[PDB]
Amino acid sequence: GTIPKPTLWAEPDSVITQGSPVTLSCQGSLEAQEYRLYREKKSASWITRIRPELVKNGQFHIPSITWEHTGRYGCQYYSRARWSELSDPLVLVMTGAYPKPTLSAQPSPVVTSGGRVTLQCESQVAFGGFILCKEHPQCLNSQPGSSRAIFSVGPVSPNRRWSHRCYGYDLNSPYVWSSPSDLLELLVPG
Numbered sequence: 192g193t194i195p196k197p198t199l200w201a202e203p204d205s206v207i208t209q210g211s212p213v214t215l216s217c218q219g220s221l222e223a224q225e226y227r228l229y230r231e232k233k234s235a236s237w238i239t240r241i242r243p244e245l246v247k248n249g250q251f252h253i254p255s256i257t258w259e260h261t262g263r264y265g266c267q268y269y270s271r272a273r274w275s276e277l278s279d280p281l282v283l284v285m286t287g288a289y290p291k292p293t294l295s296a297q298p299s300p301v302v303t304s305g306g307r308v309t310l311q312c313e314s315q316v317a318f319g320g321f322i323l324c325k326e327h328p329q330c331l332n333s334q335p336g337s338s339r340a341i342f343s344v345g346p347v348s349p350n351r352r353w354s355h356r357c358y359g360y361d362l363n364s365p366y367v368w369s370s371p372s373d374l375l376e377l378l379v380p381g
């Protein structure tokens with residue numbers, strides 16, 4: 192016999208500026224007796240149980256997010272004399288840990304019809320990698336380390352907003368990102 196899989200949710204979001212609060216809540220059944228929350232920094236590595244003293248009836252409130260908190264979380268609860276399966280994973284990212292890079296389009300944010308545009312994400316300090324996000328933002332990463340990364344984007348549709356930001360990060364902390372670049376809006380004429 193099984194008990195329902197729990198849900199793990201983050202409030203206010205899964206992506207949090209350094210030093211800002213976030214609450215991770217494991218939702219078990221209403222009869223849940225005990226909870227275990229876990230964090231993984233990378234795949235097929237250690238699994239850390241969040242210390243029980245940090246968690247109150249399944250709620251891990253983080254008043255001020257730090258490097259240590261980032262990573263992939265999962266949880267389980269105990270009911271009817273068994274531990275549940277693990278929740279679906281939740282990824283917690285901290286932004287704002289480095290100065291923001293600059294994101295620019297070449298030759299310009301106006302894309303040729305049917306074509307693509309060259310984007311440059313540039314930083315004053317070298318990063319292990321860069322991230323391009325299109326605004327639930329969808330993000331891709333590229334190697335530069337070095338101080339800039341080049342991204343191709345397109346084709347761009349005439350009827351849709353096409354808004355991008357970029358971040359830098361280091362390879363040994365892939366869930367800790369810079370402050371985001373300013374927004375870049377691409378468009379095609381018409």
Ligand SMILES: [Cl-]
Nearest residue numbers: 241242259260
């Ligand atoms: Cl912790």
